Design an enzyme around this catalytic site. Structure first.
Site, mmCIF file in Angstrom:
data_model
loop_
_atom_site.group_PDB
_atom_site.id
_atom_site.type_symbol
_atom_site.label_atom_id
_atom_site.label_comp_id
_atom_site.label_asym_id
_atom_site.label_seq_id
_atom_site.Cartn_x
_atom_site.Cartn_y
_atom_site.Cartn_z
ATOM 1 N N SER A 178 12.154 41.634 27.843
ATOM 2 C CA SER A 178 11.544 41.843 29.019
ATOM 3 C C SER A 178 12.230 40.855 30.095
ATOM 4 O O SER A 178 12.699 39.744 30.089
ATOM 5 C CB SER A 178 9.993 41.166 29.068
ATOM 6 O OG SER A 178 9.270 41.002 30.181
ATOM 7 N N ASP A 195 1.993 51.133 12.622
ATOM 8 C CA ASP A 195 2.444 49.760 12.910
ATOM 9 C C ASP A 195 3.714 49.835 13.180
ATOM 10 O O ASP A 195 4.805 49.744 12.311
ATOM 11 C CB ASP A 195 2.032 48.665 11.752
ATOM 12 C CG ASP A 195 2.710 47.586 11.625
ATOM 13 O OD1 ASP A 195 2.929 47.239 12.739
ATOM 14 O OD2 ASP A 195 2.521 46.970 10.478
HETATM 15 N N1 DBP Z 1 0.315 43.461 11.570
HETATM 16 C C1 DBP Z 1 0.320 44.358 10.350
HETATM 17 C C2 DBP Z 1 -1.305 44.175 9.961
HETATM 18 C C3 DBP Z 1 -2.191 45.387 10.579
HETATM 19 C C4 DBP Z 1 -3.294 45.561 9.997
HETATM 20 C C5 DBP Z 1 -4.066 44.628 9.175
HETATM 21 C C6 DBP Z 1 -3.299 43.495 8.794
HETATM 22 N N2 DBP Z 1 -3.842 42.320 7.868
HETATM 23 C C7 DBP Z 1 -1.805 43.278 9.163
#
Ligand code: DBP
Length: 330
Positions: free
Chosen positions: A199, A35
Site C-alpha cells: 500500500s 480464505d
Molecule cells: N484465518 C483462517 C481462519 C478462518 C476461520 C477460522 C479460523 N480459526 C481461522
C-alpha cells in the site's frame, strides 16, 4: 468457464463469511470460509472426532461415488489465531457457484481445535492463497483456484464482501457492474505464498494522506485490519477514550463513539473504509467498551488487509503468470 457464489456473514459483526460449496456425488453442500491467506481446502467430516463436532455439516466420503482416498496423504495446519486442524485426504468433485473441478484434494479433518468446534457456522475452509503453502504431505496439493485456472475464461477470481450484508465471489470473470470507477492494479510478491502487496499510505478521517509504503497481505480469512503500531496509534488517537488494552488484547473504544474513516492507498488510488466498518461491538455482552477493527500487527510479523479493509473494495485476485491485485471502490 466461470463460477459465481454468494458469500454471507456468519454473524451480525461480519466476523467471517461463508460460501456454499458442493462436494462429491451426489453433492454434499458445506458452507466454507474462503480464505485468501491459506491454501488448504479442509472440511469437517465423518472422520472428525465426534466430541469436536458441534452443529457443523460434515462431508462423508463413503457416500460420494467420486471420492477416492489419496493414499498416504496427511495434512496439518495452524492459523494466526492459534487455531488448528489436521487429518487425511480424499480427491473428489468440488463445485463453487457452477464452476466444477474434478480431482480436487478435499482434506478431511480428523481433529480440529476448540475455536472451530465452537463455531457451528463454518464447515471448513477453502484456501485461495498460493499452492506453495498447501500443507498436504508427502505430495503437496493444489488449491481449487489453481486447479480451475486453466478452464476459466480469465485466470482471476474476485472478492466482493458486504458490510453487514451478503456479497459475491466470482471465478473467471470481472463483473463490471459490481464496482464504481476503475480498478487499480498493484504488484504482488508470491515469495511468502500470500497475495502480498505494498500500500502507498493512509489517511485518518478527513486528515491529510501520509505517503508511506506498507507491505501486507490481502486476506479474506482474517476479520480485522492489522497495520504497523505507528499507523494504528495515529488512527485511535482520533477517537476520544480509545486505548490499547493488554487484558482485552487490542484497542478498545467507547461504544458511544462515532469512528472516523480510514483510507488506504493503492497506487495513486484510495480506498475509504467507513468508520462504522471499524466497530466490532462490545468486548463482552452488555459492555460499553467496544473492540476496534484496526489493530496493531506488531506481534504478528506481517501486516494484514483483512475483511475490514477488503469489504470496502471490489478486489481482483489476478492469477496470471505474473499475479497482481486490483482494487476498486464500490
Ligand atoms: N484465518 C483462517 C481462519 C478462518 C476461520 C477460522 C479460523 N480459526 C481461522
Amino acid at each position: 468457464s466461470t463460477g459465481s457464489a454468494t458469500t454471507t456473514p456468519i454473524d451480525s459483526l461480519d466476523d467471517a463469511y461463508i460460501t456454499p460449496v458442493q462436494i462429491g456425488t451426489p453433492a454434499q453442500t458445506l458452507n466454507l470460509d474462503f480464505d485468501t491467506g491459506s491454501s488448504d481446502l479442509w472440511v469437517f467430516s465423518s472422520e472428525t472426532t465426534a466430541s469436536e463436532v458441534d452443529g457443523q455439516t460434515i462431508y462423508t466420503p463413503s457416500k460420494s461415488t467420486t471420492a477416492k482416498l489419496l493414499s498416504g496423504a496427511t495434512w496439518s495446519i495452524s492459523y494466526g489465531d492459534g487455531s488448528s486442524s489436521s487429518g487425511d485426504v480424499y480427491t473428489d468433485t468440488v463445485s463453487v457457484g457452477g464452476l466444477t473441478v474434478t480431482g480436487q484434494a478435499v482434506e478431511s479433518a480428523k481433529k480440529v481445535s476448540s475455536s472451530f468446534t465452537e463455531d457451528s457456522t463454518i464447515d471448513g475452509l477453502l484456501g485461495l492463497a498460493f499452492s506453495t503453502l498447501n500443507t498436504v504431505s508427502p505430495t503437496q496439493q493444489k488449491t481449487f483456484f489453481d486447479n480451475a485456472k486453466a478452464s476459466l475464461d480469465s485466470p482471476v477470481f474476485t472478492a466482493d464482501l458486504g458490510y453487514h450484508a451478503p456479497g459475491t465471489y466470482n471465478f473467471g470473470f470481472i463483473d463490471t457492474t459490481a464496482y464504481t470507477g476503475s480498478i487499480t492494479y498493484t504488484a504482488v510478491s508470491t515469495k511468502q505464498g500470500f497475495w502480498e502487496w505494498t500500500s502507498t499510505g493512509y489517511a485518518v478521517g478527513s486528515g491529510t494522506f501520509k505517503s508511506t509504503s506498507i507491505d501486507g497481505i490481502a486476506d479474506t480469512g482474517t476479520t480485522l485490519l492489522y497495520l504497523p503500531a505507528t499507523v494504528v496509534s495515529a488512527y485511535w488517537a482520533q477517537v476520544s477514550g480509545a486505548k490499547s488494552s493488554s487484558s482485552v488484547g487490542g484497542y478498545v473504544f467507547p461504544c458511544s463513539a462515532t469512528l472516523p474513516s480510514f483510507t488506504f492507498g493503492v497506487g495513486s488510488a484510495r480506498i475509504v473504509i467507513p468508520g462504522d466498518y471499524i466497530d466490532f461491538g462490545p468486548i463482552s455482552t452488555g459492555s460499553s467498551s467496544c473492540f476496534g477493527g484496526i489493530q496493531s500487527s506488531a506481534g504478528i510479523g506481517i501486516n494484514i488487509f483483512g475483511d475490514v479493509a477488503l469489504k470496502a473494495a471490489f478486489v481482483v485476485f489476478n492469477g496470471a503468470t505474473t499475479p497482481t491485485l486490483g482494487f476498486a471502490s464500490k
